[PDB]
Design a protein around this ligand. Structure first.
Ligand SMILES: *[C@@H]1O[C@H](CO)[C@@H](O[C@@H]2O[C@H](CO)[C@@H](O[C@@H]3O[C@H](CO)[C@@H](O)[C@H](O[C@H]4O[C@H](CO)[C@@H](O)[C@H](O)[C@@H]4O)[C@@H]3O)[C@H](O)[C@H]2NC(C)=O)[C@H](O)[C@H]1NC(C)=O
Ligand code: NAG
Length: 295
């Protein structure tokens, strides 16, 4: 009530170019008539007996009206100085969510258009399930000043609606984003990829790996893998779809280093394929003994 100023520089009030702006006197009791002067231009805009009291409207806001305004009551107790800044209402920000595991996902946002004014963001979400919409829950934003809100302990089968609202001293703009955890899931590549030789088989390479650290322990959703191997300086990749955490190649060239890389995906074909793991190199076993003699 006592001259509601929005978040920003202390002593500034905001408006939109081409529209009509309304200034307010800070140190007033809502009704005490005041006088308005543009500093440097002694032409009084509105006198005390103006009709609307402690505030001031401007017909057509432009850069010539943007500046410093002084309001003082009749008594002689100066309410304060008000600076007019011009800008635009907020536009619906660009929101994009993602997930590395089936339990927690995180969303990011960015303003779709510059407003030029100090801006904050409200983040919320609600489950649509499938029974109906649950109450709105906050999307806790990331600390350290990051534009990122996280959702923890999410339901894999439910469907969410993320609400990112961009707010500046001229209004708000809401961007809703329907998000289903089954669609945005993309795990991290598997770790600990090892390409080993097999004793007694000069054409075999044992490739073993593990689940990524991003996949939680004791999972209810497993991962199916897809492995690609390729001999040294060959152009074509050979794609095999293994079962489990192992794949015994039987097509390797004897005495040639092979490059192997894997990718993961939810076993129910849900989401997309993980990015390719870093390439691991391996050479088949050498079992022919050296130094022969006659017999
Ligand atoms: C997306 O999110 C945005 C922001 O999170 C949201 O816009 C905001 O919605 C809230 C909730 O309706 C608005 O808050 C209202 O504010 C008015 C004016 O101050 C109040 O009168 C309302 O209070 C009533 O309810 C209270 C709760 O019980 C009572 O205690 C109180 O006595 C009143 O009865 C209410 O709080 C808010 O004004 C907007 N705008 C903002 C924050 O800029 C938007 O609706 C969301 N869109 C979705 C979910 O689709
Ligand atoms: C999801 O959040 C929980 C907190 O309840 C945390 O223990 C878990 O590690 C998070 N998931 C991942 C992949 O980090």
């Amino acid at each position: 009530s006592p001259c509601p100023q929005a978040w920003g520089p202390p002593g500034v009030q905001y408006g939109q170019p081409g529209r009509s702006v309304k200034l307010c006197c800070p140190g007033v009791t809502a009704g005490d008539p005041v006088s308005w002067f543009r500093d440097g231009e002694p032409k009084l805009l509105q006198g005390p007996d103006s009709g609307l009291g402690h505030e001031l409207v401007l017909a057509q806001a432009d850069s010539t009206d943007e500046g410093t305004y002084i309001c003082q009551t009749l008594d002689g107790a100066l309410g304060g100085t008000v600076t007019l800044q011009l800008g635009y209402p907020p536009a619906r920000p660009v929101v994009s969510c993602q997930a590395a595991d089936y339990e927690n996902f995180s969303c990011t946002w960015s303003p779709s258009q510059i407003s030029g004014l100090p801006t904050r963001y409200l983040t919320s979400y609600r489950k649509k399930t499938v029974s109906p919409s649950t109450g709105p829950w906050p999307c806790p934003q990331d600390p350290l000043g990051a534009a990122r809100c996280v959702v923890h302990g999410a339901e894999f089968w439910s469907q969410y609606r993320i609400n990112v609202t961009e707010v500046n001293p001229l209004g708000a703009s809401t961007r809703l984003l329907d998000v289903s955890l089954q669609s945005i899931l993309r795990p991290d590549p598997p770790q600990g990829l090892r390409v080993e030789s097999v004793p007694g088989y000069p054409r075999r390479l044992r490739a073993s790996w593990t689940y990524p650290a991003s996949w939680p322990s004791q999972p209810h959703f497993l991962l199916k893998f897809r492995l690609q191997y390729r001999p040294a300086q060959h152009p074509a990749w050979s794609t095999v779809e293994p079962a489990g955490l192992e794949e015994v190649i039987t097509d390797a060239v004897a005495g040639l280093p092979h490059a192997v890389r894997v990718s993961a995906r939810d076993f129910l074909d849900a989401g997309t394929w993980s990015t390719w793991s870093p390439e691991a190199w391996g050479t088949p076993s050498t079992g022919t003994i050296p130094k022969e003699i006659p017999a």
